[PDB]
Amino acid sequence: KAIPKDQRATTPYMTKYERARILGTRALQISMNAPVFVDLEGETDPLRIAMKELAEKKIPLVIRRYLPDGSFEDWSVEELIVDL
Amino acid sequence: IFVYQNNITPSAMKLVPSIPPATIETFNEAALVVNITHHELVPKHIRLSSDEKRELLKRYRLKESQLPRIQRADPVALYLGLKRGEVVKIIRKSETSGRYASYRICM
Amino acid sequence: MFFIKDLSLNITLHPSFFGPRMKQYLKTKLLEEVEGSCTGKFGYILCVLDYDNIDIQRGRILPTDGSAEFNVKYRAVVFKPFKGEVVDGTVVSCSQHGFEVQVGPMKVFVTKHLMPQDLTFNAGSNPPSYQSSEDVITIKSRIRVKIEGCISQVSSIHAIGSIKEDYLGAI
Amino acid sequence: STSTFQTRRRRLKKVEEEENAATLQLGQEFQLKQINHQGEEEELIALNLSEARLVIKEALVERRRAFKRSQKKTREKELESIDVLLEQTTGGNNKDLKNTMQYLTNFSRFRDQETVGAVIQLLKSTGLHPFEVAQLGSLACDTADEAKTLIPSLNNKISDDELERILKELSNLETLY
Amino acid sequence: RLVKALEDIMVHYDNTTRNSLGNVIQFIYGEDGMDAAHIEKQSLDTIGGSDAAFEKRYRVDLLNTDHTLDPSLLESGSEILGDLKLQVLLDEEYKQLVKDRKFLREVFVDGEANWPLPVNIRRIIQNAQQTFHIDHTKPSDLTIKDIVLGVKDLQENLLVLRGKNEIIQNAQRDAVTLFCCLLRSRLATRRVLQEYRLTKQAFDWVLSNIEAQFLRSVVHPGEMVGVLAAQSIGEPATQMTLKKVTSGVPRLKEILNVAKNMKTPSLTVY
Amino acid sequence: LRFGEMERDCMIAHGAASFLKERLMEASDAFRVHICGICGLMTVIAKLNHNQFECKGCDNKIDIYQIHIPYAAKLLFQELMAMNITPRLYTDRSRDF
Amino acid sequence: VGQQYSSAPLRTVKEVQFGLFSPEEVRAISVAKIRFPETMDETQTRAKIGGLNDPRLGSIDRNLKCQTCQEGMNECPGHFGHIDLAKPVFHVGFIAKIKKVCECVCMHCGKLLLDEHNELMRQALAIKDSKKRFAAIWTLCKTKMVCETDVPSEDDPTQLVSRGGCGNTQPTIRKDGLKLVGSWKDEPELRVLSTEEILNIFKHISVKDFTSLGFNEVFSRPEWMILTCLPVPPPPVRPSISFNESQRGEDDLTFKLADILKANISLETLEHNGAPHHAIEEAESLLQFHVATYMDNDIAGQPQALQKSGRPVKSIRARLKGKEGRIRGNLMGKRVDFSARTVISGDPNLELDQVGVPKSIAKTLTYPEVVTPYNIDRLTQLVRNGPNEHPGAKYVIRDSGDRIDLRYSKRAGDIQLQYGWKVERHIMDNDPVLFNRQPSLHKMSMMAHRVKVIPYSTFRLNLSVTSPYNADFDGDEMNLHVPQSEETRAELSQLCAVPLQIVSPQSNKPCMGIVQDTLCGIRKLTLRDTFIELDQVLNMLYWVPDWDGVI
Amino acid sequence: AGRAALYKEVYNVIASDGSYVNYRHMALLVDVMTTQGGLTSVTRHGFNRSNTGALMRCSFEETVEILFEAGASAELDDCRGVSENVILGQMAPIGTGAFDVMIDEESLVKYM
DNA sequence: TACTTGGCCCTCCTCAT
DNA sequence: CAAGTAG
RNA sequence: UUUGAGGAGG
Ligand SMILES: [Mg+2]
Ligand SMILES: [Zn+2]
Ligand SMILES: [Zn+2]
Ligand SMILES: [Zn+2]
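Structure tokens for the assembled complex are given below, as produced in the milestone run.
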């Protein structure tokens, strides 16, 4: 169906599984020779770079949260508050 | 509503669902000596308008099935005299958060 | 006969190309895997229209390798012959079994016995040809055929066509 | 492959694929009733030669443009003017398109996107089905017999006199060479 | 069995406990949406205690020489004594705490006041204590409005559910209710100023934290609750190394199987 | 070493979605088979060379997908089929919800 | 996985549609006529006769061929075959329903025994639950045994209305062995219901009748519970076992097929020869037998169909039956690679979240790392290092889907790495791993630790992380699983990491603490009575790795 | 009021041992057992007969028998069941995969 | 009436046909 | 060893 | 190699 960016309802925060998976995903990619969007302060470990890319919210990813009924909500790493 | 004492004839009983829309219900004396709802354990239930219900669904994005059900013959279901389709809101106490609201549809 | 059907393609892009100009490589690769394709279900995919406003939507990341997959919705000009359709092309080859005309990107063949009778076949001709009381058909001669049937195949489509009917033949 | 804007519920028994003929019975993929990306409905897209030659040249050209928006950071005469636009914005190995432009440029019946405009406006007062409304646009026709015979799906959908006038106004708009 | 019987159950993004059919099994995980890990045994002071002690601890009367706040605590002490518009907010606060009383004594007849609740308030203040080096001598500087009006403003952000409507926004008050009682319990004017001499600064902090600590205690849509709960019960079951009634391991079997002939039928009538 | 049911249950509890899949596929079974876009079966005659595909009886060559599943499951199916039961594999849902 | 690129698109299963095979489809699909009962030997000549296994089905003897499908052994799923029975047979498992069905519809005309007319019926028909309709349809008409041709409509019980006809009495039915018999009632009439007949009475059942009874016009029409054409699983389902060459090794299944086949041909060869009428149904029950047995073998009508040696015989169903079998034993739980186990011992010198991995294992277990500009150097060093010193590797795999064995390859010491290639290296210090001790009944029974390559042969775990796995060191063994994808690791390190599991949700309280020595000793060290002097108070300070250097 | 009992009873079977289980767990179970309508046993008789998919209930006790009646009644499976995917070799909609991830090409330009 | 399936997890040996 | 389920 | 039984380990 799709849900408007407005009328949105889920948690303003990032679920640990999201964080976990995004760092995982992003790491996989960085490790795949994907482009890196931060100054590697010399870092050389992907999941470490992913950790940085995530701290500067410079991760081009988007989380599609599905609902029991099928419709979802789209959120970007940018938006999502990263407490934890 | 008809209150029999010891019992009604099975010849009799087969005459209640024969004059709709109207409806009839049979209750035993010994079953009403005490109101069950007054029990420590039975939380209060409540009938939902064909509207309040259509709302609930639309408010949780629920299909009718996915809703926790209540027996058509369930003690309390007769105390309120539900109907196959009517939904009940059950507000009870909770040692986790004062009050918890649960719903029960009827089968 | 030619059409402008609305299509969509699926491209799985490797993380490598997850750059700044991705929209670019996507579109570009779309083109490499469509322009020049042939399906029985779509005939000849000749050109992608409105290059600029190709819809990419959000591509999702697969889940074992970073690869992301986008459902590119485009639109383009196609053309797939039909039986009973009539189109005219330029003959290309010609033999003791008939001549093959070329309608658009496709090629339709005409059997010696699917054309009129008073039209024999000249072997000792250069280039090879078919002679009639008043007509002469060879290499470049323009004909107009009626596609009797089509036979899809690989990355191309052929069909046999007759010129035995009326209002058909040369022009 | 290349999915087509319409998910038919192919529930096992995929048996009934009728025939293809100018009975206006084109593969289900070309029902005169098809779907647009926007999710709306839209008539099939009947493209007659030379009306297509224009459309192709149209995007092939406007491509050369947006193709260089990112680079900063007469018969035998057009046979050449096109062989170039290709060797610039085409896959080059799309030998099908080369041949499509020749055929589409040799047998075409119009040069002006104007003339082609009238062709359309004219033929589009019929109620005729797209395929006809194209075969009529890319096939010379003097008599109505020639038309309603080289396009059998016409037969009862228009008096011979009418279709005749229309054929008259074609050779009248038929750009010269 | 317990496991196979609950695999598919997890908290969904709407904050509902469903399965693979999507049949709501719980509308809010645990009837409160809290992740078990962020819960500690707190005490609901508002419950136990003579009606006497209750007054002497939470009652504040700005229209009384012996029931007003000694200006040794509040900066604006003396200049508040009598203020009528305040005694309305003060009375409002109290009429509440009392309602809470009767409420709790209606959900926990035992009188037991120690229960598992998110956000450990007792400590969250203790840290506030020595974090701002608070001296029990000099007076605070919290408007009475500062306090009671901020406390109300906190509850507004302790969002468990989000919804843009009534049914939902109503469930909100529900799933929070219990916690709040504990909140008002610990942030009642008299306490805040007489027991833990907070300063405006310390206060604005303790508040800021409860809010944030709470939002963290919420369950995460994804948590595979079923299996969790499953294990959580079948695990303590193996640790069962074994006044005269059917009990323990065999009892549990009796229960899960929904058996009709339990060895001990028994029945307590009062 | 065997990654028994229990182990699975724990991973599920953790929400170790990907890891679990991985233990189960890449580190064990994992197999690639072809299906019919029509009858969700492993009929498909993939010649993976001259790109030929087919799946006669349903007769195809056009609508064919490729999937990754545990060789064990492959077997599970074939075994079921030999028992005359058809386990259809469809790459898209038509029942919505 | 599998290897070799396929131009076929790649999707994930989203639906599983269960159906039954239409004898017609079984045919369509098959690639083998399967007429002979024997295996190979074209008169002892080794190959395979166009008879059983490979009359085009899969193959053996390491040979491409497979109906050009080539690909050989690995990459080629089997290719089903069929085998035309002679006479229709039941279906071991469906018999129960095939039976119930009949009690649901009378023969001769084959149609329901209760239409919209009967009211008790109506209600049964509202139930949108195939499982429950059928379960109430049956209950209602298993009793009525008269194909009523006229019934009192919704008006007067006086006026009789008509529908279908032929009231032919309905016989009650019972199950005897693998056949159905019923009496037709002075005194009864007992006759055995021929498959050939039942089947026929099903084909005729109405389309809305299928439907009304728990069925589906497309995937499962009752007329399919009776087997006509039989699906013949290809080799990979019933492989062999060759003790080199001139020997045997056929699988149990490959036999029942053989038997079913034999028992089929003999039947047929009686209907086109001296057919002693009812001396055939004496050999037709043999086919019904075998064909039933080959699928189910643990039945009530005893005879286990023992295989020469008294060894039971593995019915297909057997393979799937819970635990140790397919479903539960192969799919819900498998053996896995990149795992190891030994004996655990305690070690007060390892951070809670670590785990001592014996050099032995570290050199054995491997992690697939992707050659990147970030590591090339470090990686090339490990590759040169060989698979013998510790910090090293043991496999380099290039984009060209081909593995280089580091311990042999005449180029072992050579090798320039290529950005993108993968270098399976040893497990190194700080490689997140999933450690655990069974029985596993806790989220905690499994936790991610930091690998610590150590000497001696044991998994050296920290004490405080003891109670969680619930283990001691009295010969207690443990498991270790090594992740494989940058994201896998992350999952372990981000949710399985021991430092996370510290507070137990199953009891909203920590689930690890200080025990034994450290516990006991901490009390002693505490006591007001306890005082420590300089020289020592200095050594102690040095031990807390985070000591601010401030005595 | 029954749920009340069922739970109150289960609780006491863990209390008699001096153990502690945070409500929610026992509540969840007590609840799973109750919702459907009344008392649904944690046995092949109860829960494993409900609307769940075939492959799922199939991985517990009635295996083959369960399957048979599935293709027989042309059952359809969602593959929303943890088990379903585990059997298939696909990441199950659980934690990590309880949502999707995508590269927003838009934001992918503001990052340079 | 009678009987049917359920039966910790994992691991390791040795033996015999 | 048992209890329940179903014919 | 598969299988089937017995002994043992936490
Ligand atoms: Mg021990
Ligand atoms: Zn097929
Ligand atoms: Zn093959
Ligand atoms: Zn009849």
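DSSP finds three helices and four strands in chain F. Residues 81 and 87 of chain F are 7 Å apart (CA to CA). Further analysis is deferred to the final report.
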